[PDB]
C-alpha cells in the first residue's frame, strides 16, 4: 500500500521486472533501471537523442479500446538464473528500422553485445510482442517475435518497412547469439494477403509451444476486423505452424467484443486470461456497462481447437482462405466478468485459489478470487488512482516481494500491496472475505500476511482460509 510512486516526463511504453536487478521501464526514447522500491533511477539509457527523452514525434492516443503508440517495442530480460554468467536484456525500438539489441541485464550505461534491424515494428502504432526460449542441439537462446512490420508509409523519406520479400512476415525467429539476430529461411510465419493487418497483443510459452494472441485490425480505419485469435507455433529453431483459433468473449454484448486489450497466462493452471472489448465509438459515446469483459480460456481447448488451416497465415497444403474456417473457442462461462472499462489483467495462484488483478480506465485496481467452479466473485477494489488515469495493459508482479504488484498508468509506476488485510478487525470478519493473502493472527489480534505475523510452529498464530471462519476463537 501507498505511494513509493515513480514519475516520468513521458508516457510509459513498457515495463519489465527483473529478478535480481531493478525494474525496467521505457518512457519516450529512454529506458530507466529503477530500484524495486521505485526510489532511485540507478541507470538510464538514451536511445535516440543524447540527452533528450522527449518524443521525437507526437503520438495522439486514440480511443481506449484502440491500441496506442510507443517507441519501445520489446523489453525482455532473460538468462537470469545462470550463476557465473550475468543476465541479459532485449530492448527493441522503432528506431533504426525496428532495431533490437542484446544488453547486459543491469547497468544501462554498458554497451550492447549484439543488435539487428527489422526485429520488431518500426511503426510507433504497430504491434510487437515477443518471447525468449531455448531450442536446438546447442540449446541456443531464441526470440520469437510477432509484429506489424508493414504499414502504409506516407512520408517518402522516413520509410522503414522491410524488403518486398519480407512484406508478408507475421512472426519471426531470431537467433540471439548470431549475426544481426538473424532469421533463417524457415524461421518465419507469413501473412495471408488481404487479411489486412494483424495486431499482436502478447506472446508466451505453453506445453512445448509458443502462442500469440492477436486480432485483425485496420490501423488507418482504427477498427477491428475479424475475431480475436491466437496463433500456435512449435518451440523450435524453425517455424512449425500448429494452428489458429478464434476466441469468443462477446457474451453480454450484441455485436461482441472484437478487441483484445490484455493477456495473461495463469502459470500453474493452464488457463489463459484476457480482457476483451467492443468499440466505444470513435470518441467515447458508445460506452456501456457491458463494453468490456474478462474471459478465461482453457489452454487445452485452445490447443485442441487450433487447426493448421490457412486463414490469416500461409501454409503449403492450402491456399489463403479457401479451406475450412478457424474454430471459435468458448471461455470458461463461470469465470466471465462483464464490466464497463477493464484495461489490464494478471493472474496466478496463491494457496490453490486463482487470483486475478484487473486494471480500469478509471484508474482502479480490482481483484477477483475464483471459487470452486472457477466462478467469478464480486471484484474488490485495492487501489484507486486519484487522477483516474487508465491502467497500462500490463500488470507486473514484484519478483522480490510476493505481497506487491507494480501498477502502471499514464506516466507513473506504483508499488501497490496485493491486499489490505488491515480493513478487517474481527477474526470471522476477515476469514470470510476469502483472501488467500489475508489470515488472522493469534498474536496481536489482527488480520495480516504470514510475514507480518510471527508464524511460529509451537503456537499456530496465523490462520488460513483453508479452514474458514469455523475455527476462530469465537
Amino acid at each position: 500500500a501507498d505511494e513509493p510512486v515513480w514519475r516520468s516526463e513521458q508516457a510509459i511504453g513498457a515495463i519489465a521486472a527483473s529478478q535480481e536487478d531493478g525494474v525496467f521501464v521505457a518512457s519516450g526514447s529512454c529506458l530507466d533501471q529503477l530500484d524495486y522500491s521505485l526510489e532511485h533511477s540507478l541507470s538510464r539509457l538514451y536511445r535516440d537523442q543524447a540527452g533528450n527523452c522527449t518524443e521525437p514525434v507526437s503520438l495522439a492516443p486514440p480511443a481506449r479500446p484502440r491500441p496506442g503508440s510507443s517507441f519501445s517495442k520489446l523489453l525482455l530480460p532473460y538468462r537470469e538464473g545462470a550463476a557465473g554468467l550475468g543476465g541479459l536484456l532485449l530492448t527493441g525500438w522503432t528506431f533504426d528500422r525496428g532495431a533490437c539489441e542484446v544488453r547486459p541485464l543491469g547497468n544501462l550505461s554498458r554497451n550492447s553485445l549484439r543488435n539487428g534491424t527489422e526485429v520488431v515494428s518500426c511503426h510507433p502504432q504497430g504491434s510487437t510482442a515477443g518471447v525468449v526460449y531455448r531450442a536446438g542441439r546447442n540449446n541456443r537462446w531464441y526470440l520469437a517475435v510477432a509484429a506489424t512490420y508493414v504499414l502504409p508509409e506516407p512520408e517518402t523519406a522516413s520509410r522503414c518497412n522491410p524488403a518486398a520479400s519480407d512484406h508478408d512476415t507475421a512472426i519471426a525467429l531470431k537467433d540471439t547469439e548470431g549475426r544481426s539476430l538473424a532469421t533463417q529461411e524457415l524461421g518465419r510465419l507469413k501473412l495471408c494477403e488481404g487479411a489486412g493487418s494483424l495486431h499482436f497483443v502478447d506472446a508466451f510459452l505453453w506445453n512445448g509451444s509458443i502462442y500469440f494472441p492477436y486480432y485483425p485490425y485496420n490501423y488507418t480505419s482504427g477498427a477491428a476486423t475479424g475475431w480475436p485469435s491466437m496463433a500456435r507455433i512449435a518451440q523450435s529453431t524453425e517455424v512449425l505452424f500448429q494452428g489458429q483459433a478464434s476466441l469468443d468473449c462477446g457474451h453480454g454484448h450484441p455485436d461482441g467484443r472484437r478487441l483484445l486489450l490484455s493477456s495473461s497466462l495463469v502459470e500453474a493452471l493452464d488457463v489463459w486470461a484476457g480482457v476483451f472489448s467492443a468499440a466505444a465509438g470513435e470518441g467515447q459515446e458508445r460506452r456501456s456497462p457491458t463494453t468490456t469483459a474478462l474471459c478465461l480460456f482453457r489452454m487445452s481447448e485452445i490447443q485442441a481447437r487450433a487447426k493448421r488451416v490457412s486463414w490469416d497465415f500461409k501454409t503449403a497444403e492450402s491456399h489463403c482462405k479457401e479451406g475450412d474456417q478457424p474454430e471459435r473457442v468458448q471461455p470458461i462461462a463461470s469465470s466471465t466478468l462483464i464490466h464497463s472499462d477493464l484495461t489490464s489483467v494478471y493472474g496466478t495462484v496463491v494457496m490453490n485459489r486463482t487470483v486475478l488483478f484487473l486494471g480500469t480506465g478509471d484508474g482502479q485496481l480490482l481483484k477477483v478470487i475464483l471459487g470452486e467452479n472457477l466462478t467469478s466473485n464480486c471484484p474488490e477494489v485495492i487501489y484507486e488512482i486519484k487522477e483516474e488515469t487508465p491502467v497500462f495493459y500490463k500488470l507486473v508482479p514484484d519478483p522480490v516481494k510476493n505481497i506487491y504488484i507494480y501498477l502502471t498508468a499514464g506516466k507513473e509506476v506504483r508499488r501497490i500491496r496485493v491486499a489490505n488485510c488491515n480493513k478487517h478487525k474481527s477474526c470471522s470478519e476477515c476469514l470470510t472475505a476469502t483472501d488467500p493473502h489475508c489470515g488472522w493472527c493469534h498474536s496481536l489480534q489482527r488480520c495480516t500476511f504470514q510475514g507480518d505475523c510471527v508464524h511460529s510452529e509451537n503456537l499456530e498464530n496465523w490462520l488460513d482460509i483453508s479452514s474458514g471462519a469455523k475455527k476462530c476463537p469465537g
Binding site: 534491424t117 524488403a163 518486398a164 520479400s165 519480407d166 519471426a172 548470431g178 544481426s180 532469421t183 529461411e185
Partner: protein
C-alpha cells in the same frame, strides 16, 4: 557397383529405389548421391569401396523426375534441390556449403526451371560471380504474351548476406535478365531456352567466354544463339531496373563489395523489389541474330573449337534432336 536402397527398405513396396542423381569426383574420391527411398544421401567411392556419408539434403532430390541442379566450387556447394519434402512450392538457388547458408528470396523468380550454372572469375577475386540459366513464367500477362521466358541470373560469389535480421541469410546481389534469341531478317523468335554450353576463349579472357544457348518455340523449331560473359556482365552493371525510375542507390544492386561488407539495406530493398534489369541480353557481334535456326527440335548442345589440317579454326556444334539423333 550396386549402391542399393539398403538404408531402410520400405514396407508396402512401390518406388523406394535409390536413384543415383549426382556423380562428382572430389579429392576424397568419387561422390555419388541418390534419392535413397526419399531420404537424400551420398556415398564415397574411393578404392573399390562404397563408404556412406549418410543423409545430405540438397545433394539429391526425393524423386528422380525432379528439376535438379548442384554446382561445386572449392569447398562450396550450391543447389536448387529442396532440403525437405514438406517444403513449399518455391524453388530456390541456395549455397548449401560454405561460410553461411544463403537462399534466394520469394520475389526473384516465378516457377523457375533451372538449366545450368557456372562460376565466373572476373578481374578481382571479390567480384567473382555465379551465373545460372533458367526458364520462368513471363511477368507480362497479356494474352498475346508467351507463357514462359528465358533468363540468366547473377549472384556475387562473395555475397555476405544482408544487414537486417530478415535479410542476413538471403542472397543480396541477385539480378536477372531476359535472354533474347530472335532472327533479324525475319521476325522469328525462339523464347524457350533448352540448354547452355560454355566455351572459354583461347585468350584466357573471361569477358571472351562464349555462352551457346539452344532455343525452341511453340512449334518446336530451334535456333542457336551465342553470347559473351562480357556482354552479360555489361548488362548487369549498366542497365536500369524494370519498374524503378529513380536514381539507383550508391552501392549499385548486384555489385559485389570489397572487404566482406554486407549489402546495405537501401541497396538490397531496391534489388529485392525490382530484380529484373530492363535491358535484354542479345547475341554477340553486330546483327544480334542466331548462328542459325531450323525446323528441327534441338534439346542439347556441345561445341568444339578445332583446327583444320591447314591450321584454320572452326567451331563445330553438336546438337541432339528429340528424335534421338545428333546433328553436326
Amino acid at each position: 557397383v550396386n549402391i542399393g536402397s539398403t538404408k531402410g527398405s520400405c514396407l508396402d513396396k512401390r518406388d523406394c529405389e535409390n536413384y543415383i542423381t549426382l556423380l562428382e569426383r572430389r579429392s576424397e574420391g568419387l561422390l555419388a548421391c541418390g534419392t535413397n527411398a526419399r531420404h537424400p544421401s551420398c556415398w564415397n567411392l574411393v578404392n573399390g569401396t562404397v563408404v556412406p556419408l549418410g543423409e545430405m539434403r540438397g545433394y539429391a532430390p526425393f524423386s528422380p523426375d525432379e528439376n535438379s541442379l548442384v554446382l561445386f566450387e572449392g569447398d562450396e556447394v550450391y543447389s536448387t534441390i529442396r532440403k525437405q519434402e514438406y517444403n513449399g512450392k518455391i524453388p530456390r538457388f541456395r549455397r548449401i556449403r560454405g561460410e553461411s547458408e544463403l537462399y534466394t528470396s520469394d520475389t526473384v523468380m516465378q516457377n523457375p526451371q533451372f538449366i545450368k550454372a557456372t562460376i565466373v572469375h572476373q578481374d578481382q577475386a571479390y567480384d567473382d560471380k555465379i551465373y545460372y540459366f533458367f526458364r520462368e513464367d513471363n511477368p507480362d500477362k497479356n494474352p498475346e504474351a508467351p507463357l514462359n521466358v528465358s533468363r540468366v541470373a547473377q549472384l556475387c560469389r562473395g555475397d555476405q548476406g544482408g544487414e537486417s535480421s530478415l535479410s542476413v541469410s538471403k542472397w543480396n546481389t541477385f539480378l536477372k535478365a531476359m535472354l533474347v534469341c530472335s532472327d533479324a531478317a525475319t521476325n522469328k523468335n525462339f523464347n524457350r531456352l533448352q540448354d547452355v554450353f560454355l566455351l572459354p576463349d583461347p585468350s584466357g579472357q573471361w569477358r571472351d567466354t562464349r555462352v551457346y544457348g539452344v532455343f525452341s518455340n511453340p512449334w518446336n523449331y530451334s535456333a542457336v544463339c551465342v553470347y559473351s560473359l562480357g556482354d552479360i556482365d555489361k548488362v548487369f552493371r549498366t542497365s536500369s531496373l524494370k519498374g524503378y525510375h529513380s536514381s539507383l542507390p550508391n552501392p549499385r544492386p548486384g555489385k559485389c563489395l570489397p572487404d566482406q561488407q554486407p549489402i546495405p539495406t537501401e541497396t538490397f530493398q531496391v534489388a529485392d523489389r525490382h530484380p529484373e534489369v530492363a535491358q535484354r541480353v542479345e547475341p554477340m557481334g553486330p546483327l544480334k541474330t542466331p548462328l542459325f535456326h531450323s525446323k528441327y527440335h534441338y534439346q542439347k548442345v556441345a561445341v568444339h573449337r578445332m583446327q583444320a589440317s591447314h591450321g584454320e579454326t572452326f567451331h563445330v556444334l553438336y546438337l541432339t534432336t528429340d528424335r534421338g539423333t545428333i546433328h553436326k
